[PDB]
Structure formats: C-alpha cells, structure tokens
C-alpha cells in the first residue's frame, strides 16, 4: 500500500460476516469512507459461506437441545476465523459482538483503539457455538441492551466509534471526552420560527462563550443523565458553573 | 404496493440522511431485506443535498461562537424533514439520534416499535442547530454512550432492532425478553478442541433443558451484568435456579 498521508496509527480490521456487502456502508461513504481510501483504516472481510464444502453452502446448524432457531455452522465459521487470524498476523485480538459482551461505552472504544488490528466476528441466527467463544474470542461486547438482526452493525459500529481514535481520520479529545452531554449548537438564520440564538455566541466574547458552553454541558448532563456525573471529579470551574445552573433552574 | 404475507403492523420508517446509501446495508440483505421485500418495513429516504438551491449543493454552515467544526446546514435539512412529515401524514414520530438523546434498550425499542410511522433524523458534522431540535424533533435518543461520524448507523441499529417487533419479520418474545442475559449455545460437533457439549442437552429431556438454559441465563447475569437482575422480579423458579448457581460458583 502507497500514499502520501501520514498513517502511523493505520488500524486493520479482519471482518467475519455472511454479509460483507453491508460494510459498503462505513467503506464507501463519509469519514470512515476517507479513511479507507487514504490507508488509515484497512477493512477486510471473511465470509464462512466461502469456507463451506457441500452443494448448498450450508452455515447454520441445529442446536443441541432444540429450541426453534438454529446457530451458526461450527466449521465454515471456525475457519473463517482461522484464515482471518492467519492474515492478521500476530497481536490481532478477536472480539465477538452480542449482547452477552462488556457494554461498550467512550472510555472503551479508546482501550479498543490502542489495538492496531482487530477481528470482529459477526453472529447470525442464534448466535455462535460456546466452545468457539472459549477457543478462539478474546473479548465479547455489547453496543447496547437491546436484540438486533445480526453482529453487523455492532461491528460497523465499533470500526466507526475506533476510527475517530485513529489520528488524521478526523478534520478525538472532543467534548463528550469530558464525560458530559454537548452543548446546543446555533448556525444561521439568526432567529429561526421566532427563537433566537443566545446573544453570548454573538458576543465574539471567546472566554465567556467557553464558560456558556460548558455550563450548557454541565445542566445538560445535570437535567438529562444525572449518573454520569457521578463518575467525574469536576473542576473547580465545573463546580461552580453546574452551582450556577442548578440555582438558574430552581 | 401488493403481496401475499401478512402486514397488518407493517412500519413506514422515513429517514433524513446526507448518506443514504448506508440503508442499503438494511434493505438488501438478511431479515431486515427480506422485510422490506415482503412489505412489511418500508424505508424511504431523503437527502438534504436535494434540497439545496446553490451551485456546490452546500450542506454544512459555520457555528455561531466559533469552535473548529461545522453544523448541518438549517434550510436544506428543514426541508427535507417537512418533505418526509408531508409524506408520512399524520402520526408519524420524529427521533433525532445523538449522545444526548434518551438511551436505547430492548424496552425502549418495544415502546418505539408501537408507532407505526417514525422519521429518523440523521446529524452529521457537529449536529444540527438547537431551535430544529426544540421545533422538529418529538424524541432525542442515543443507541448507546459513544460518538460515532453521524447518526446513520444508530439509525440502522434502531431500524433493525424494532424491525424484530413487526410480526412476520421473525421465521420477538425472545430470551433478552426476559430481562436475562442468553444461555450457552451448542451444535454440531459433539467434541471441538476436547470441549464436549453438557449432557443434559443430549437427554432429550426437555423440562431439565429449559431449566439448564433459565439456570445459565441466571448464573451469567449474576457473573456478567449483576444490575440487570435488580431491575427484575425473580419467579419463585428463578430464584431457586440463581441460588442453586450462587452456590455452586462458591
Ligand atoms: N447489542 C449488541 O451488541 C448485539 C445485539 N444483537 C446481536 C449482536 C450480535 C448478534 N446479535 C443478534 C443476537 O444476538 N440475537 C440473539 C439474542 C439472544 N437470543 C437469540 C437471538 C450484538
Ligand atoms: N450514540 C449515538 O447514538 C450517536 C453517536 N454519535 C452520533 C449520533 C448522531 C450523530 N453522531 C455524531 C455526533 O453526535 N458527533 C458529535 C458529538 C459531540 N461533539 C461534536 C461531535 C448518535
């Protein structure tokens, strides 16, 4: 691979999926789209139907047990997994996506990050052997307590959420890197269905504005997700702003 | 539109996307394709670029106060939110995704598959300006505590995980349904790596199965996830299981 911007902290990220079509989606289009064409993010996809042998191309199995669904076929799957492991080389960690995983949150997404190569394994139907889990996953994550379809868009999601990490992707050490909620936003018009924009933001006024927004922040995260602040030990400045919006809100 | 199957709680979901492209990554592949072929989702979107009036089809504008980032332009997305309201008729729910929006978990979704209409607004750059929020915007929510490039894969995740709902989808009142993390699952072969499958779900004993698979699902909530069990009224069946598993594990 050849080009002319800088890629130190490249990422490459091995993909198990039966629909490696749906990662188009974070390939072709927008910042991870860039990311990809300049070689800061490498994306490259397994797909088990490939690694079957019968006429059909068979890749779920019944469970044990019964049950209605069916789980994904142990030997398509295992050497998908295998052959991605055999092009990643060494130090690749493999994680397996589902709701059973450590719920992702920021502060994972960087630990996530400080791999240069990852393998992100899909699951559909009912999910993966167990035995697969205990024999090659390094790590199970969730993106959130709630069922989808399939690993996929778990995976785009976390290439997507790690990519910001990557330096030069972005055009990072953001504000929700403060643990808090973001501020209101205001572009133009002016006064939009009678509602103005707060007259600070106006004021050229760049200190009073950093105060403005970090207050916003601060009664935001206040109103709206009182428990995130309990993780932080607030400023000083922090301290007296969130004082002053909760005494503006009584 | 026509067809045999079914559709009686079929979904209308319109979506306001600079990139939508993305949604094909739903609508043509797995369950959620297999949906929207057999009418039971429709995903119609919209794209802001098309609603502009300049030359470079601008989309972004600058911040009111500075700060290094853009905001989604306020006419071009106005716009094509009041095209998909006049589309959607009456009834239809408008969901801004971000960080700051409501957090999303498998009731959340069962609450937002009851509309049968929904709009999904998608912010790219640095969000959209606060009055189109206060003005157009029903519902804020956020798939999970993490930033993403924009709002489209959360969008995604939400389509698909209220996808699951619309009877038919499925070939639901699930496992995760019970408020429990997911029993290990097995197939074929009956040893991999010198692993071999528990017994009891080769017994065809189908009462010890279901009470193996409540008492893993159990143990792994308690191990994993101890929170989620707090939020629960334990069966008299479950609490003998969780105890049962306690005891063992110690
Ligand atoms: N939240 C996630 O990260 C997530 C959600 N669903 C996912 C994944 C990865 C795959 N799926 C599908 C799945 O696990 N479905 C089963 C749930 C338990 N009962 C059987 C269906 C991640
Ligand atoms: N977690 C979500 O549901 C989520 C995450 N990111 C999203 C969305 C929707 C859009 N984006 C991008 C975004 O909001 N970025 C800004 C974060 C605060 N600072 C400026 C960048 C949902």
Redesign the pocket.
């Known amino acids: 691979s050849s080009g002319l911007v800088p890629r130190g902290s490249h990422m490459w990220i091995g993909v198990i999926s039966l629909f490696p079509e749906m990662f188009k989606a974070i390939t072709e289009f927008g910042v991870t789209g860039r990311a990809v064409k300049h070689n800061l993010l490498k994306v490259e996809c397994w797909n088990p139907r490939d690694f079957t042998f019968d006429k059909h191309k068979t890749v779920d199995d019944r469970p044990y047990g019964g049950g209605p669904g069916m789980l994904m076929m142990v030997q398509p799957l295992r050497d998908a997994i295998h052959t991605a492991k055999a092009a990643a080389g060494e130090g690749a960690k493999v994680i397996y996506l589902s709701p059973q995983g450590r719920k992702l949150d920021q502060g994972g997404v960087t630990e996530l990050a400080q791999n240069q190569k990852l393998i992100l394994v899909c699951g559909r139907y009912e999910g993966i052997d167990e035995r697969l889990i205990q024999t090659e996953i390094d790590e199970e994550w969730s993106i959130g307590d709630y069922v989808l379809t399939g690993g996929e868009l778990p995976a785009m999601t976390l290439i997507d959420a790690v990519a910001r990490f990557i330096p030069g992707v972005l055009g990072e050490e953001?504000?929700?890197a403060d643990g808090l909620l973001?501020c209101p936003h205001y572009t133009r018009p002016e006064v939009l269905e009678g509602l103005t924009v707060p007259p600070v933001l106006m004021s050229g006024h760049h200190e009073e504005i950093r105060k403005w927004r970090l207050k916003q922040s601060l009664q935001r995260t206040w109103l709206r997700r009182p428990e995130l602040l309990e993780g932080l030990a607030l400023t000083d400045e922090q301290r007296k702003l969130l004082k002053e919006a909760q005494a503006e809100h009584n």
């Open positions: 953001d504000s929700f973001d």
